[PDB]
Every structure is written in C-alpha cells, then in structure tokens.
Amino acid sequence: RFLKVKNWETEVVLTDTLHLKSTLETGCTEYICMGSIMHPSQHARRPEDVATKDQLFPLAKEFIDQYYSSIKRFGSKAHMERLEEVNKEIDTTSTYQLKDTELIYGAKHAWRNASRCVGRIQWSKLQVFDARDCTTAHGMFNYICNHVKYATNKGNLRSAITIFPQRTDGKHDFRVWNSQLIRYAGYKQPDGSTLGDPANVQFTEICIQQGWKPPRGRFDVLPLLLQANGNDPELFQIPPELVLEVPIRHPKFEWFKDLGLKWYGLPAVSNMLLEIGGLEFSACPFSGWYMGTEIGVRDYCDNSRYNILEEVAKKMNLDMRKTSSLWKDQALVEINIAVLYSFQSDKVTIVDHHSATESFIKHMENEYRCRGGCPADWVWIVPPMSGSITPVFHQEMLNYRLTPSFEYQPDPWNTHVWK
Amino acid sequence: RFLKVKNWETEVVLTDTLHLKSTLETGCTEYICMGSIMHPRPEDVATKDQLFPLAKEFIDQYYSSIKRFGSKAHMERLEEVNKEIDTTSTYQLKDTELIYGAKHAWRNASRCVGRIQWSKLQVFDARDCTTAHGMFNYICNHVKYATNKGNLRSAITIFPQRTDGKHDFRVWNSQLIRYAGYKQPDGSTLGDPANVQFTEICIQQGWKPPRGRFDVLPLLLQANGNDPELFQIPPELVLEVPIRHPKFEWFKDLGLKWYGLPAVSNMLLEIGGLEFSACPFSGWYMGTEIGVRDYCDNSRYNILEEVAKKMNLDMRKTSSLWKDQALVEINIAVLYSFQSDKVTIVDHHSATESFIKHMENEYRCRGGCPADWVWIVPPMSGSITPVFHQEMLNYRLTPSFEYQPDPWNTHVWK
Numbered sequence: 068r069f070l071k072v073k074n075w076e077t078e079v080v081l082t083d084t085l086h087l088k089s090t091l092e093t094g095c096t097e098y099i100c101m102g103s104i105m106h107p108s109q110h111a112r113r114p115e116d117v118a119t120k121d122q123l124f125p126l127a128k129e130f131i132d133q134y135y136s137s138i139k140r141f142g143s144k145a146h147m148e149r150l151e152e153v154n155k156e157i158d159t160t161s162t163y164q165l166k167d168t169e170l171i172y173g174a175k176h177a178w179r180n181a182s183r184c185v186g187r188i189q190w191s192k193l194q195v196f197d198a199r200d201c202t203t204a205h206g207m208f209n210y211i212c213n214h215v216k217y218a219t220n221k222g223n224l225r226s227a228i229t230i231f232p233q234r235t236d237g238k239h240d241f242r243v244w245n246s247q248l249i250r251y252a253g254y255k256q257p258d259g260s261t262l263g264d265p266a267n268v269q270f271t272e273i274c275i276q277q278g279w280k281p282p283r284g285r286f287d288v289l290p291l292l293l294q295a296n297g298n299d300p301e302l303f304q305i306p307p308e309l310v311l312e313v314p315i316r317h318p319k320f321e322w323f324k325d326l327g328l329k330w331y332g333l334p335a336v337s338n339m340l341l342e343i344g345g346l347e348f349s350a351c352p353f354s355g356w357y358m359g360t361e362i363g364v365r366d367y368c369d370n371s372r373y374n375i376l377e378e379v380a381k382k383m384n385l386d387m388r389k390t391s392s393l394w395k396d397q398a399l400v401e402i403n404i405a406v407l408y409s410f411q412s413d414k415v416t417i418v419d420h421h422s423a424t425e426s427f428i429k430h431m432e433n434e435y436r437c438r439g440g441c442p443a444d445w446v447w448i449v450p451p452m453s454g455s456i457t458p459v460f461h462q463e464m465l466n467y468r469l470t471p472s473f474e475y476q477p478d479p480w481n482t483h484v485w486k
Numbered sequence: 487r488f489l490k491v492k493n494w495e496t497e498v499v500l501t502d503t504l505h506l507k508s509t510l511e512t513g514c515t516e517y518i519c520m521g522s523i524m525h526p527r528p529e530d531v532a533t534k535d536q537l538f539p540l541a542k543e544f545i546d547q548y549y550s551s552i553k554r555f556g557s558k559a560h561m562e563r564l565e566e567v568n569k570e571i572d573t574t575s576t577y578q579l580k581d582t583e584l585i586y587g588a589k590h591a592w593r594n595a596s597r598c599v600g601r602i603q604w605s606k607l608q609v610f611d612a613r614d615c616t617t618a619h620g621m622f623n624y625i626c627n628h629v630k631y632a633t634n635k636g637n638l639r640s641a642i643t644i645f646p647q648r649t650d651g652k653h654d655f656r657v658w659n660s661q662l663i664r665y666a667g668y669k670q671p672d673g674s675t676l677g678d679p680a681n682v683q684f685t686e687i688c689i690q691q692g693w694k695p696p697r698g699r700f701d702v703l704p705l706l707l708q709a710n711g712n713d714p715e716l717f718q719i720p721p722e723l724v725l726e727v728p729i730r731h732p733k734f735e736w737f738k739d740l741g742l743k744w745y746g747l748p749a750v751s752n753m754l755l756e757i758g759g760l761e762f763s764a765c766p767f768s769g770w771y772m773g774t775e776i777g778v779r780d781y782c783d784n785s786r787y788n789i790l791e792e793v794a795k796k797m798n799l800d801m802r803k804t805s806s807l808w809k810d811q812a813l814v815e816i817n818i819a820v821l822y823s824f825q826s827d828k829v830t831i832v833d834h835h836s837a838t839e840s841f842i843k844h845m846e847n848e849y850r851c852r853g854g855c856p857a858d859w860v861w862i863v864p865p866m867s868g869s870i871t872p873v874f875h876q877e878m879l880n881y882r883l884t885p886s887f888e889y890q891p892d893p894w895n896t897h898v899w900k
C-alpha cells in the first residue's frame with residue numbers, strides 16, 4: 068500500500084509512495100530481512116551476456132519513458148521518435164546509444180537513487196564528463212587525469228563522473244581495476260606484518276606483478292590499472308601534482324604531526340557499474356568529498372586497515388589494559404578532530420558527520436515532499452562513530468531499489484583472460 | 487535451502503539453516519526493506535482452531551529439545567493440550583515448558599546483544615497471582631533477587647497469561663525502576679523527559695511526587711483487567727550508583743546517578759500461542775544505554791551541553807567534535823562508577839565481542855541466530871566494535887518477546 072516513516076526525535080512522519088516504482092528485489096522476504104548483508108540480491112535487470120531484443124528493449128522503453136516524463140513530455144513527437152530510434156538501433160546493433168541529455172539525467176539519478184549515500188543533497192549538482200569516444204588505456208588515463216584535476220579544483224572539490232563506453236558483448240569491457248582512483252599501496256612484510264593499506268595488498272601485488280616499481284612506503288599512491296575494450300590492463304602513474312594530500316596534525320596535540328600520517332583529498336569510486344535503461348557502463352569513476360569519519364574512523368581505525376588506535380592511545384597515555392577505560396573510544400575522537408582540522412586548515416573540502424547527517428535529513432524532507440519518497444539504507448547512512456547523537460540514528464528509513472542505479476560488479480581479475 | 491553471512495573483518499562465514507523454521511513476518515517485503523522501522527486489538531485473542539497448531543509446534547519443539555520427540559510422554563502431552571483447548575478454549579503450560587519458553591524467547595530476541603547469558607535465566611512462576619497486591623509482592627522479590635547486592639542476576643517473573651483480553655495483567659511501568667519527569671510551566675523539564683506522561687498518570691492516580699530530578703517512580707500494577715494500583719518499591723530495594731569520573735574532580739558535582747537494574751516490564755511474552763501480557767525481565771546494563779542514550783539523547787537527560795562546558799570545549803562549531811568528546815568521558819564515568827561500587831555492568835566492547843562469540847556458537851549447534859544489526863551495534867563508536875562488520879540475518883522465531891500497546895490507550899476504567 069503506502070508506507071510511513073517516523074523520526075523518533077521529532078515525531079515527524081513522512082509518507083512514502085515512491086517505493087511503488089521499485090523494480091528489483093532487495094533480498095528480503097516477509098520472513099527474513101537482509102538489510103545488513105553487503106550484497107543481498109543478485110537480481111539483475113538483464114541476462115548474462117548480449118541480450119535479445121525482447122530482453123533489452125523493455126528496459127530501454129522504461130528509461131526513455133521516465134526521462135521524457137521527467138521533462139513534461141511523454142507522448143511528444145520527440146519521445147515517440149526516440150522509441151522508434153532505439154527500437155531500430157537494437158534491431159541492427161543489438162544495443163542503443165544515449166543522447167547526451169539522457170546520459171546526464173541517468174547519471175544524476177543513479178546518484179539520487181543511491182540508498183547508501185549520505186551526500187545526496189547535492190545530487191543534481193553533478194558534472195558528467197562523456198567519454199564514450201574512448202578507445203585505449205592511454206585515452207582512459209587522459210580522461211581520468213582531467214577528472215581528477217577538475218574535481219580537485221585546488222582543494223575546493225566538485226562532484227564529477229566520467230563515463231566510458233558501455234558494455235557490448237562482455238569481452239570488450241572497459242574497467243578501472245583500481246577500486247578508487249587514488250589509494251595507498253599495502254605491502255606484505257617478511258615478518259607476516261603489513262605496511263601501508265592492508266585492504267590493497269592484493270591490488271598492490273597485481274600492480275607489482277604487472278611491472279610496478281614499488282617505493283615500499285606507507286603512503287605510496289598506487290598506479291592506475293586501466294583496461295579498454297577487453298584488452299590487457301596497463302599501468303599508469305598519476306602525476307603527483309594532480310593528487311592533493313592533507314598532512315594530519317592536531318589542534319592541541321603537537322605530538323600528533325610526528326605520527327607521520329597524511330590522507331588524500333579526493334574520494335573517487337571506480338569499481339562500480341552504472342546502469343541506465345539496460346545499458347551497462349562498467350567504467351564510471353565518480354567523486355565528491357569526504358565525510359571525515361571515512362578517513363578517521365574507517366580508514367585509520369578499522370582493524371584490517373591502518374589500525375593506528377593503540378599507537379595514538381599510547382601517545383595519549385591511556386589505560387589500555389582493559390576495554391572499560393574506553394581508550395579506543397577516546398583516541399578515535401581525537402583522530403577525527405585531527406582529520407577535520409587538517410582538511411579545514413588546508414582549505415580542502417570536507418564535511419563532518421554532524422552536518423552531513425543533518426543535511427541528509429533535510430534532503431529526505433525535500434524528496435518526500437516533491438518526489439513521494441527517498442530510498443535510504445539505515446545501516447550505511449548512520450556514521451560509524453557517535454551514531455545516536457546524530458539525527459539519522461533516530462530516523463526510520465525505507466530501502467528499495469530504483470533505476471538508474473550504481474551496482475557492484477566482480478573484481479575484473481577474477482574474470483579477465485590474459486594474452 | 488541455506489544462507490551465508492560473512493564477517494567482513496575476519497572473512498569468517500556462517501551457514502544459517504535455522505531461518506527455515508520461522509513463520510512470522512519481519513515487515514520487509516520482497517521489494518522493500520523495513521529493517522530500521524521500529525514497529526513494522528484485545529479481542530484479537532486466539533480462537534480454538536487458531537490455538538491448536540501453535541501449541542503443537544511448541545510442544546514438538548520442546549520435546550525435540552529434550553531428546554523425547556515422538557516419545558510416549560510427548561504424544562500424551564500433545565493430546566492433553568488438545569483436550570484443554572477443546573474444552574477450556576486455552577491450556578496451561580507445565581512448569582518445565584514455561585522455563586524453556588521464557589529462556590527461548592530471550593534466545594530468540596534478535597535485538598538483544600546480551601544473549602550469550604540466555605540459558606542462565608531465573609524464571610519466577612507468578613501464574614497463581616490474582617491481585618495488584620500480589621503482583622507488587624512478586625515484583626519486590628524479583629527486584630531483590632536480581633539486584634543481589636550489586637552482583638546482578640538475570641530473572642523474569644511471569645504473571646497469568648491472557649484469557650479473553652478483558653482480564654489482562656499489566657505492569658503499566660515500561661521498566662520497573664525508572665525516574666520521573668515533570669514538565670515545568672516555563673517549558674523546561676525536570677527529571678527524565680521520557681517518563682513525563684507516565685509521571686502525569688501516576689500523580690493523577692494519587693502519587694505525591696517529590697518533584698526532584700531522580701525520583702524513583704511508583705509501580706502501577708493491574709491484575710485481572712482491574713484498574714491499576716500504586717505501590718512504592720521500598721527504597722532499600724532500589725540499588726543506585728552515583729556517577730563520578732576518575733579524572734575530573736568536577737564530575738560528581740553534576741549530581742547524576744542511575745539505577746542499577748534494567749528491568750523491562752511493558753512487553754508481551756508469547757509461548758505456544760499463549761500471551762503473557764505481564765512478564766517483567768531484567769539483566770544488567772551495558773554502559774552505553776545510560777551513557778549515550780539516557781544522558782545524551784536530546785529527548786532524554788541531554789547533558790552534553792552541560793558536560794562540554796565544564797570540559798571547556800569549543801561549542802561554537804560542530805566540527806570541533808565537542809559532542810563526540812564529551813560523550814566519551816560520560817561513558818567512562820558511567821563505567822567507572824558502577825565498577826567502583828561493585829555493581830555489574832558491561833562496556834560496549836566486551837558486550838559486542840561476547841555476542842560475536844555467542845553468534846558463532848549458535849550457528850555451530852543451532853543452525854543460526856537471528857540478529858538485528860540496527861540494534862546490536864552500540865550507539866557510539868560503532869565500527870570499532872566487532873559486530874559492525876558482522877553480517878546478520880534477521881527473522882522472528884517463537885517463543886518471542888513482543889511489543890504491546892500502552893495500557894492507558896486501551897484500558898477501560900472500572
């Protein structure tokens with residue numbers, strides 16, 4: 068029917084009708100809820116490989132219909148012609164091609180439909196760089212460097228996506244093998260320990276195994292591993308002058324800078340799949356700006372990551388003998404005060420979790436008021452520290468899957484046949 | 487057929503077969519998820535034909551648990567229940583069934599992070615109770631036993647099940663020990679703002695309030711659908727802990743204390759299709775419940791502003807993370823204060839680790855363990871506790887604990 072959500076701190080109730088326009092399964096049933104499973108569903112809007120006409124066209128009619136509906140047509144001559152244009156195109160090339168307006172609309176709406184993104188208040192202020200003309204790893208690197216440079220903007224970041232040619236037969240995929248454009252390398256020491264970023268040890272080895280000359284430090288910016296039209300990937304080194312970086316100091320603890328830490332300024336996700344009207348853009352790196360907790364809670368403090376808590380705690384003179392002292396908790400706060408203070412002192416865009424969550428509530432308000440709802444994933448919106456003292460903690464959320472969408476996809480090296 | 491949950495911190499993977507044995511809604515549909523919705527009639531008491539299959543599932547479940555499935559005593563107990571539902575239109579749990587029932591409802595409570603202790607529960611059969619006075623007595627002996635001079639024990643007291651929905655036993659208090667809250671004319675709120683509507687009801691039923699900040703509320707007890715009655719838990723039975731800080735001399739001057747015994751009394755215990763509308767249960771506190779939620783939620787005691795000030799924090803801009811900083815020190819103070827007075831408590835780190843250990847064991851020997859990530863994860867410092875990175879399948883087994891509407895919304899006054 069129609070579903071209400073309530074904020075247990077304000078008693079505000081919103082009514083959700085947008086969920087009726089949902090098409091794919093979430094993973095849940097009346098009997099089992101999977102809202103904490105990382106990839107609960109494998110429901111996909113098309114089959115495995117190059118789809119028949121009866122597969123691809125209905126998806127495409129839905130998106131075109133949606134887009135022409137967005138702009139107060141539907142039934143217009145332009146819309147009817149467009150249906151016939153896509154129809155004949157699928158007939159003759161087994162696919163179709165997005166108008167530039169179409170592609171910008173879908174890119175913004177995949178962001179706007181991203182149930183896990185706390186940052187969607189900005190969704191319509193996105194910069195799309197069409198790169199469907201691209202043919203080589205080298206051209207990919209030139210498109211990515213311009214993305215980085217525009218997005219970074221001397222520290223005053225801007226949102227942007229760069230969209231490479233869509234998928235055709237699955238053996239000509241365009242892939243950024245990096246999970247993010249800019250990440251640090253992780254090295255597997257001889258004594259079993261791990262220097263760098265432990266998450267990337269497998270990628271940092273494929274790079275090495277591909278010819279990369281590792282400087283073997285802590286903050287080694289990984290190369291790019293770019294794959295074009297199915298071919299073997301190709302290492303590229305982003306010019307350092309394009310990788311903005313913030314050294315972490317603390318506004319009271321002078322001993323903090325001596326910890327020797329820095330992070331990069333540009334979060335740029337590049338392993339995900341953009342899906343629009345049944346077309347699959349397997350390479351679509353997008354970028355915005357960091358919520359401090361992403362660096363200071365997850366990046367520095369997760370166990371299988373930088374794990375600096377003991378060392379920051381020890382420098383703080385903390386009772387690390389039992390958990391009850393909350394020594395982990397205290398260091399965690401100071402680290403995030405340091406991350407925020409460093410990005411702001413270097414006028415690099417960053418948002419804290421209080422103002423980020425606060426804004427997402429305001430976004431939710433807007434979306435319900437004019438769109439009839441807003442898909443939100445409570446498990447992922449709620450920041451990983453101080454949850455209950457942020458507004459989203461006390462806000463009920465409905466989760467459902469709208470298209471266009473961002474999607475996970477397999478890591479390419481599980482799939483790619485070399486040559 | 488099977489389902490896998492993965493721990494994204496340790497790569498450990500567990501195989502949930504137990505979810506096949508659930509038959510109650512979660513609220514989620516195949517195309518929409520409601521995992522963050524908090525809650526997705528009295529004539530709605532079960533009919534005879536409604537009750538037969540539920541009883542059969544529970545009795546089978548019980549005889550299975552104890553290695554007696556299909557046995558002579560199983561088959562006779564089965565027909566013995568049918569005779570009762572046929573004649574009396576209900577039935578009566580044996581004492582052993584009731585203990586197994588109450589222990590499994592805890593075991594099956596997917597939102598409770600404390601279930602590793604589930605099978606050491608102390609069940610007090612109060613089904614022979616007929617009056618409010620009898621309830622107050624049973625409840626005092628519960629409090630006294632559970633508190634055990636600071637070394638808390640978990641315990642449940644079960645009052646007579648429902649009958650026709652017209653003679654419910656109800657503990658009107660949401661918890662047995664809670665502080666009062668009085669709205670001032672000027673808009674401000676004294677005491678605990680959660681309990682302000684219940685404080686009004688109490689006063690209207692006669693309670694003479696101290697009008698202080700930490701008045702323990704009177705019990706408001708209802709038996710056999712009669713009007714509820716007031717009782718004062720004898721102060722010598724309410725253990726309390728004054729909250730001081732191990733580093734901040736000034737902290738004790740905040741004037742704060744908390745009660746020592748969390749005891750929830752407003753939920754409904756459901757075993758074999760029977761509904762025990764009054765079933766108070768108790769364990770011990772995890773620190774964050776007092777430190778993060780009770781003291782710091784804006785709708786609760788809301789002392790972050792007061793603490794940060796004495797801490798000299800820059801409270802002009804949120805990015806200073808004063809809130810975050812002041813919140814930790816309070817939770818340090820809560821944990822130090824309880825431990826000093828040798829009153830049981832568990833911090834969110836030990837608690838969550840126990841639950842991961844309990845979860846794996848429950849997959850080992852039971853085939854699963856329903857959990858609610860939205861509730862298991864502590865309300866502060868989430869991702870540094872190990873349950874954050876633990877995938878969790880959520881489903882409703884019975885016996886279960888259930889919410890029920892507030893008594894003053896549905897009760898018709900004598």
Ligand code: HEM
Binds near residue numbers: 178186189227353357
């Ligand atoms: C502009 C400021 C932005 C902020 C503050 C922000 C914030 C966040 C955060 C904190 C997460 C959680 C991810 C994690 O903790 O691993 C997330 C997820 C996500 N964001 Fe946003 N984001 C922003 C911009 C964007 C843009 C421009 C896009 C797409 C064009 C986007 C799409 C997504 C998607 C698809 C996810 C899901 C990630 C996944 O499932 O792995 N975000 N965002």
Ligand code: HEM
Binds near residue numbers: 640770887
């Ligand atoms: C023994 C130590 C225990 C600990 C450390 C513990 C901890 C917790 C915590 C922190 C919550 C979250 C409550 C909230 O934030 O509102 C919770 C929920 C819950 N606990 Fe436990 N608990 C314990 C014992 C028990 C016992 C003895 C029972 C029943 C016999 C029980 C049944 C429940 C239920 C049903 C919930 C769900 C609350 C709801 O659905 O609203 N717990 N527990």
Ligand SMILES: Cc1cc(N)nc(-c2cc(CNCCF)cc(F)c2F)c1
Binds near residue numbers: 247334336353354
């Ligand atoms: C556009 C954007 C803005 C922002 N503030 N963060 C991210 C962001 C997203 C992810 C994806 N989450 C699962 C991958 F493992 C990982 C990160 F490390 C991020 F930094 C992305």
Ligand SMILES: Cc1cc(N)nc(-c2cc(CNCCF)cc(F)c2F)c1
Binds near residue numbers: 661750767775
């Ligand atoms: C047996 C037990 C142990 C423990 N540690 N906490 C609770 C506990 C449970 C609730 C229920 N939550 C829904 C109402 F909001 C509220 C509290 F205030 C509690 F303290 C109960």
Ligand SMILES: C[C@H](O)[C@H](O)[C@H]1CNc2nc(N)[nH]c(=O)c2N1
Binds near residue numbers: 462
């Ligand atoms: C709306 C949201 O589900 C709600 O605020 C929940 C989140 N998780 C919770 N978890 C616990 N333990 N207690 C709570 O009250 C809540 N509240």
Ligand SMILES: C[C@H](O)[C@H](O)[C@H]1CNc2nc(N)[nH]c(=O)c2N1
Binds near residue numbers: 878
């Ligand atoms: C099991 C669980 O889904 C997993 O740990 C999630 C929890 N919530 C998260 N939320 C965000 N924003 N980012 C994450 O990586 C995760 N991890």
Ligand SMILES: [Zn+2]
Binds near residue numbers: 099101514519520521
């Ligand atoms: Zn769900």
